[PDB]
Protein backbone atom coordinates (compact mmCIF):
# COMPACT_ATOMS: atom_id res chain seq x y z
CA UNK A 1 0.00 0.00 0.00
CA UNK A 2 1.30 3.47 -0.87
CA UNK A 3 1.57 6.36 1.61
CA UNK A 4 -1.22 8.91 1.27
CA UNK A 5 -2.13 12.12 3.03
CA UNK A 6 -5.62 10.94 3.93
CA UNK A 7 -5.89 8.25 6.57
CA UNK A 8 -9.02 6.12 6.36
CA UNK A 9 -10.55 5.01 9.65
CA UNK A 10 -13.08 2.31 10.36
CA UNK A 11 -14.27 0.38 13.42
CA UNK A 12 -15.41 3.56 15.18
CA UNK A 13 -18.41 4.07 17.40
CA UNK A 14 -21.31 5.09 15.19
CA UNK A 15 -23.61 6.10 18.05
CA UNK A 16 -21.86 9.44 18.59
CA UNK A 17 -23.13 12.48 16.75
CA UNK A 18 -21.39 13.69 13.60
CA UNK A 19 -20.29 17.07 14.94
CA UNK A 20 -18.99 15.52 18.15
CA UNK A 21 -17.16 13.00 15.98
CA UNK A 22 -15.64 15.80 13.89
CA UNK A 23 -14.50 17.76 16.96
CA UNK A 24 -13.08 14.59 18.50
CA UNK A 25 -11.26 13.62 15.29
CA UNK A 26 -9.73 17.09 14.95
CA UNK A 27 -8.66 16.76 18.57
CA UNK A 28 -7.26 13.25 18.07
CA UNK A 29 -5.32 14.13 14.95
CA UNK A 30 -4.10 17.62 15.79
CA UNK A 31 -1.14 15.90 17.46
CA UNK A 32 0.38 14.29 14.40
CA UNK A 33 0.12 17.02 11.80
CA UNK A 34 -2.00 19.81 10.49
CA UNK A 35 -5.45 18.46 9.62
CA UNK A 36 -6.71 20.36 6.61
CA UNK A 37 -10.00 18.47 6.30
CA UNK A 38 -11.97 15.61 7.82
CA UNK A 39 -14.68 13.65 6.03
CA UNK A 40 -17.14 12.07 8.43
CA UNK A 41 -20.22 10.70 6.74
CA UNK A 42 -23.16 9.19 8.61
CA UNK A 43 -24.87 7.46 5.68
CA UNK A 44 -25.37 3.70 5.89
CA UNK A 45 -22.55 3.06 3.43
CA UNK A 46 -20.08 5.35 5.16
CA UNK A 47 -21.11 5.48 8.82
CA UNK A 48 -18.55 4.46 11.42
CA UNK A 49 -15.76 5.52 9.05
CA UNK A 50 -13.81 8.74 8.78
CA UNK A 51 -11.12 10.24 6.59
CA UNK A 52 -8.51 12.64 7.92
CA UNK A 53 -6.61 14.69 5.34
CA UNK A 54 -3.14 15.86 6.36
CA UNK A 55 -0.82 18.41 4.81
CA UNK A 56 2.30 16.24 4.97
CA UNK A 57 2.90 12.56 4.30
CA UNK A 58 5.10 12.08 7.34
CA UNK A 59 2.34 12.89 9.81
CA UNK A 60 0.08 10.24 8.27
CA UNK A 61 2.91 7.74 8.73
CA UNK A 62 3.32 8.92 12.32
CA UNK A 63 -0.42 8.55 12.92
CA UNK A 64 -0.34 5.03 11.52
CA UNK A 65 2.71 4.26 13.63
CA UNK A 66 1.12 5.52 16.85
CA UNK A 67 -2.58 4.75 16.67
CA UNK A 68 -2.55 1.04 15.81
CA UNK A 69 -5.57 -0.12 17.77
CA UNK A 70 -6.47 3.00 19.70
CA UNK A 71 -9.39 2.76 22.14
CA UNK A 72 -11.74 5.42 20.80
CA UNK A 73 -15.28 5.78 22.20
CA UNK A 74 -15.09 2.23 23.49
CA UNK A 75 -13.89 0.71 20.22
CA UNK A 76 -10.35 -0.04 19.06
CA UNK A 77 -10.15 1.96 15.85
CA UNK A 78 -8.46 0.70 12.70
CA UNK A 79 -6.58 3.31 10.69
CA UNK A 80 -5.16 2.56 7.26
CA UNK A 81 -3.87 4.65 4.43
CA UNK A 82 -6.88 5.48 2.31
CA UNK A 83 -6.96 3.69 -1.04
CA UNK A 84 -7.51 6.90 -3.02
CA UNK A 85 -5.95 10.33 -2.72
CA UNK A 86 -8.08 13.28 -1.60
CA UNK A 87 -9.78 15.98 -3.58
CA UNK A 88 -7.82 18.73 -1.81
CA UNK A 89 -4.42 17.03 -2.02
CA UNK A 90 -4.96 16.13 -5.68
CA UNK A 91 -5.86 19.76 -6.32
CA UNK A 92 -2.82 21.04 -4.42
CA UNK A 93 31.70 17.23 5.35
CA UNK A 94 31.34 18.35 1.77
CA UNK A 95 28.82 19.54 -0.81
CA UNK A 96 29.21 16.37 -2.84
CA UNK A 97 27.73 13.14 -1.58
CA UNK A 98 28.67 9.78 -2.98
CA UNK A 99 25.77 7.35 -3.06
CA UNK A 100 25.90 3.60 -3.23
CA UNK A 101 23.31 0.84 -3.33
CA UNK A 102 21.08 2.94 -5.51
CA UNK A 103 18.31 1.20 -7.37
CA UNK A 104 19.00 0.86 -11.07
CA UNK A 105 15.44 1.71 -11.98
CA UNK A 106 15.44 4.98 -10.02
CA UNK A 107 14.18 7.93 -12.02
CA UNK A 108 15.93 11.26 -12.16
CA UNK A 109 12.90 12.98 -10.75
CA UNK A 110 12.80 10.51 -7.90
CA UNK A 111 16.37 11.21 -6.96
CA UNK A 112 15.76 14.88 -7.01
CA UNK A 113 12.76 14.25 -4.85
CA UNK A 114 14.64 12.33 -2.18
CA UNK A 115 17.81 14.42 -2.19
CA UNK A 116 16.13 17.78 -2.83
CA UNK A 117 14.28 17.55 0.48
CA UNK A 118 17.40 18.95 2.07
CA UNK A 119 17.50 21.99 -0.18
CA UNK A 120 18.48 23.09 -3.70
CA UNK A 121 20.66 20.65 -5.49
CA UNK A 122 23.32 21.75 -7.90
CA UNK A 123 23.26 18.62 -9.97
CA UNK A 124 23.17 14.88 -9.72
CA UNK A 125 25.12 12.40 -11.73
CA UNK A 126 23.90 8.87 -12.04
CA UNK A 127 26.39 6.28 -13.02
CA UNK A 128 25.85 4.80 -16.40
CA UNK A 129 29.01 2.94 -15.54
CA UNK A 130 29.20 1.25 -12.22
CA UNK A 131 25.50 1.00 -11.73
CA UNK A 132 23.76 1.78 -8.46
CA UNK A 133 26.13 4.64 -7.79
CA UNK A 134 25.64 8.37 -8.01
CA UNK A 135 26.98 11.72 -6.97
CA UNK A 136 24.64 14.25 -5.47
CA UNK A 137 25.79 17.83 -5.34
CA UNK A 138 24.26 20.47 -3.14
CA UNK A 139 24.55 24.20 -3.62
CA UNK A 140 25.01 24.73 0.09
CA UNK A 141 27.23 22.70 2.40
CA UNK A 142 24.86 23.06 5.32
CA UNK A 143 22.16 21.36 3.30
CA UNK A 144 24.60 18.65 2.39
CA UNK A 145 25.43 17.97 5.99
CA UNK A 146 21.78 17.58 6.82
CA UNK A 147 21.16 15.26 3.93
CA UNK A 148 24.16 13.17 4.80
CA UNK A 149 23.09 12.75 8.35
CA UNK A 150 19.53 11.81 7.47
CA UNK A 151 20.01 9.86 4.23
CA UNK A 152 22.40 7.14 5.27
CA UNK A 153 20.50 3.91 5.76
CA UNK A 154 17.67 5.54 3.87
CA UNK A 155 15.08 3.09 2.73
CA UNK A 156 14.05 3.55 -0.84
CA UNK A 157 12.59 0.39 -2.27
CA UNK A 158 12.81 -1.56 0.90
CA UNK A 159 14.84 -4.23 -0.80
CA UNK A 160 17.75 -1.86 -0.51
CA UNK A 161 18.97 0.88 1.82
CA UNK A 162 21.17 3.62 0.53
CA UNK A 163 24.62 4.34 1.78
CA UNK A 164 25.73 7.89 1.43
CA UNK A 165 29.16 9.23 2.19
CA UNK A 166 30.81 12.58 1.73
CA UNK A 167 32.79 12.80 -1.44
CA UNK A 168 36.49 12.68 -0.86
CA UNK A 169 39.01 14.81 -2.65
Amino acid sequence: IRPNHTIYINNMNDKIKKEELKRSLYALFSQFGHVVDIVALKTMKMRGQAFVIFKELGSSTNALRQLQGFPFYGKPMRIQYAKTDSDIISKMPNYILFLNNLPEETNEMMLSMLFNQFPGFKEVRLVPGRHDIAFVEFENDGQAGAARDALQGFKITPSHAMKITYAKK
Binding site: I16, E20, R23, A27, L28, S30, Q31, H34, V35, I53
Partner: protein, 162 residues
Protein backbone atom coordinates in the same frame (compact mmCIF):
# COMPACT_ATOMS: atom_id res chain seq x y z
CA UNK B 1 12.94 32.29 20.12
CA UNK B 2 10.26 33.95 22.24
CA UNK B 3 6.64 34.45 21.17
CA UNK B 4 5.41 37.98 20.35
CA UNK B 5 2.64 39.52 18.25
CA UNK B 6 4.97 39.24 15.24
CA UNK B 7 4.54 35.47 15.02
CA UNK B 8 0.79 36.00 15.45
CA UNK B 9 0.44 38.46 12.57
CA UNK B 10 2.35 36.34 10.03
CA UNK B 11 0.96 32.90 10.89
CA UNK B 12 -1.80 31.08 9.05
CA UNK B 13 -5.27 32.38 9.88
CA UNK B 14 -8.08 30.38 8.37
CA UNK B 15 -11.08 28.13 8.86
CA UNK B 16 -10.21 24.75 10.32
CA UNK B 17 -11.55 21.30 9.47
CA UNK B 18 -14.27 21.57 12.11
CA UNK B 19 -15.23 24.99 10.63
CA UNK B 20 -14.08 27.39 13.35
CA UNK B 21 -11.64 30.29 13.13
CA UNK B 22 -8.11 28.96 13.47
CA UNK B 23 -4.66 30.37 14.10
CA UNK B 24 -1.84 27.90 13.48
CA UNK B 25 1.35 27.95 15.56
CA UNK B 26 3.02 24.70 14.55
CA UNK B 27 6.76 24.24 14.88
CA UNK B 28 7.86 27.46 16.58
CA UNK B 29 9.60 26.09 19.75
CA UNK B 30 7.79 28.68 21.89
CA UNK B 31 8.73 28.33 25.59
CA UNK B 32 6.36 30.95 27.08
CA UNK B 33 2.94 32.16 25.95
CA UNK B 34 2.38 35.92 26.06
CA UNK B 35 0.90 38.79 24.05
CA UNK B 36 -2.01 36.85 22.54
CA UNK B 37 -4.57 39.68 22.81
CA UNK B 38 -3.49 40.99 19.40
CA UNK B 39 -5.74 38.32 17.87
CA UNK B 40 -8.63 40.78 18.57
CA UNK B 41 -11.04 37.98 19.66
CA UNK B 42 -11.70 36.76 16.12
CA UNK B 43 -10.76 33.14 16.81
CA UNK B 44 -12.28 29.96 18.21
CA UNK B 45 -9.34 27.56 18.15
CA UNK B 46 -5.58 28.11 18.44
CA UNK B 47 -3.11 25.29 17.75
CA UNK B 48 0.19 24.97 19.64
CA UNK B 49 1.90 21.88 18.25
CA UNK B 50 5.69 21.53 18.69
CA UNK B 51 6.47 24.27 21.18
CA UNK B 52 8.57 24.09 24.35
CA UNK B 53 5.91 25.59 26.61
CA UNK B 54 6.85 24.61 30.16
CA UNK B 55 3.61 25.86 31.74
CA UNK B 56 0.23 26.74 30.23
CA UNK B 57 -0.07 30.27 31.57
CA UNK B 58 -0.07 33.86 30.40
CA UNK B 59 -3.47 33.63 28.77
CA UNK B 60 -5.26 36.95 28.19
CA UNK B 61 -9.01 37.50 28.02
CA UNK B 62 -10.32 36.05 24.75
CA UNK B 63 -14.04 35.34 24.91
CA UNK B 64 -14.79 33.62 21.59
CA UNK B 65 -12.29 30.72 22.02
CA UNK B 66 -13.75 27.21 22.11
CA UNK B 67 -10.64 25.04 21.62
CA UNK B 68 -7.03 25.07 22.85
CA UNK B 69 -4.70 22.60 21.14
CA UNK B 70 -1.58 22.09 23.22
CA UNK B 71 -0.46 18.91 21.45
CA UNK B 72 3.11 17.74 22.12
CA UNK B 73 4.45 20.36 24.52
CA UNK B 74 6.37 20.28 27.80
CA UNK B 75 3.61 21.17 30.26
CA UNK B 76 4.91 20.13 33.68
CA UNK B 77 2.93 22.70 35.67
CA UNK B 78 -0.43 24.17 34.66
CA UNK B 79 -1.89 27.65 35.07
CA UNK B 80 -4.77 28.15 37.47
CA UNK B 81 -6.36 31.44 36.40
CA UNK B 82 -7.42 30.22 32.98
CA UNK B 83 -11.21 30.30 33.36
CA UNK B 84 -11.28 34.05 33.97
CA UNK B 85 -9.71 34.67 30.54
CA UNK B 86 -11.17 31.83 28.43
CA UNK B 87 -14.81 31.79 29.52
CA UNK B 88 -16.41 29.87 26.65
CA UNK B 89 -13.96 26.99 26.10
CA UNK B 90 -15.17 23.59 24.95
CA UNK B 91 -12.06 21.56 24.06
CA UNK B 92 -8.73 21.46 25.90
CA UNK B 93 -6.21 19.29 24.10
CA UNK B 94 -3.36 18.55 26.49
CA UNK B 95 -1.85 15.57 24.69
CA UNK B 96 1.81 14.52 25.07
CA UNK B 97 2.93 16.56 28.05
CA UNK B 98 4.53 15.78 31.42
CA UNK B 99 1.66 16.00 33.91
CA UNK B 100 2.53 13.59 36.72
CA UNK B 101 0.44 14.24 39.86
CA UNK B 102 -3.34 14.17 40.36
CA UNK B 103 -3.39 17.63 41.95
CA UNK B 104 -1.77 19.02 38.80
CA UNK B 105 -5.15 18.48 37.13
CA UNK B 106 -6.87 20.44 39.93
CA UNK B 107 -7.09 23.88 38.16
CA UNK B 108 -9.14 22.33 35.35
CA UNK B 109 -12.33 22.21 37.45
CA UNK B 110 -12.67 26.00 37.22
CA UNK B 111 -13.83 26.00 33.57
CA UNK B 112 -17.62 25.75 33.74
CA UNK B 113 -18.36 25.42 30.02
CA UNK B 114 -15.71 22.74 29.41
CA UNK B 115 -16.94 19.68 27.52
CA UNK B 116 -14.02 17.83 25.89
CA UNK B 117 -10.65 16.98 27.44
CA UNK B 118 -7.68 15.03 26.13
CA UNK B 119 -4.79 14.40 28.52
CA UNK B 120 -3.28 11.49 26.60
CA UNK B 121 0.41 10.51 26.59
CA UNK B 122 0.85 11.91 30.09
CA UNK B 123 2.31 10.29 33.22
CA UNK B 124 -0.81 11.43 35.15
CA UNK B 125 -2.69 8.83 33.11
CA UNK B 126 -0.36 6.17 34.55
CA UNK B 127 -1.60 6.29 38.14
CA UNK B 128 -4.54 4.33 39.54
CA UNK B 129 -7.96 5.95 40.16
CA UNK B 130 -7.07 8.59 37.54
CA UNK B 131 -10.12 8.95 35.30
CA UNK B 132 -12.61 8.75 38.15
CA UNK B 133 -10.63 11.49 39.88
CA UNK B 134 -10.94 13.62 36.74
CA UNK B 135 -14.70 13.04 36.63
CA UNK B 136 -15.10 13.67 40.38
CA UNK B 137 -12.87 16.75 40.03
CA UNK B 138 -14.21 18.27 36.80
CA UNK B 139 -17.84 17.10 36.48
CA UNK B 140 -18.82 19.24 33.49
CA UNK B 141 -16.61 17.35 31.03
CA UNK B 142 -18.68 15.04 28.82
CA UNK B 143 -15.90 13.47 26.72
CA UNK B 144 -12.70 12.47 28.51
CA UNK B 145 -9.78 11.16 26.43
CA UNK B 146 -12.24 10.39 23.60
CA UNK B 147 -14.22 8.13 25.93
CA UNK B 148 -17.72 9.27 26.82
CA UNK B 149 -18.45 9.35 30.54
CA UNK B 150 -20.84 6.76 31.96
CA UNK B 151 -22.95 6.75 35.09
CA UNK B 152 -20.96 3.89 36.61
CA UNK B 153 -17.93 6.17 36.30
CA UNK B 154 -19.88 8.99 37.98
CA UNK B 155 -20.92 6.70 40.83
CA UNK B 156 -17.45 5.29 41.46
CA UNK B 157 -16.10 8.82 41.09
CA UNK B 158 -18.42 10.02 43.86
CA UNK B 159 -17.65 6.98 46.04
CA UNK B 160 -13.90 7.48 46.33
CA UNK B 161 -12.00 10.03 48.49
CA UNK B 162 -15.08 10.83 50.62
Amino acid sequence: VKLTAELIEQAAQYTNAVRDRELDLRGYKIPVIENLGATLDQFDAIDFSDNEIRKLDGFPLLRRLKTLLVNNNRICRIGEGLDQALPCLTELILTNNSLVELGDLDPLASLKSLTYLSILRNPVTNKKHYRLYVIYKVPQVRVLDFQKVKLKERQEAEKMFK
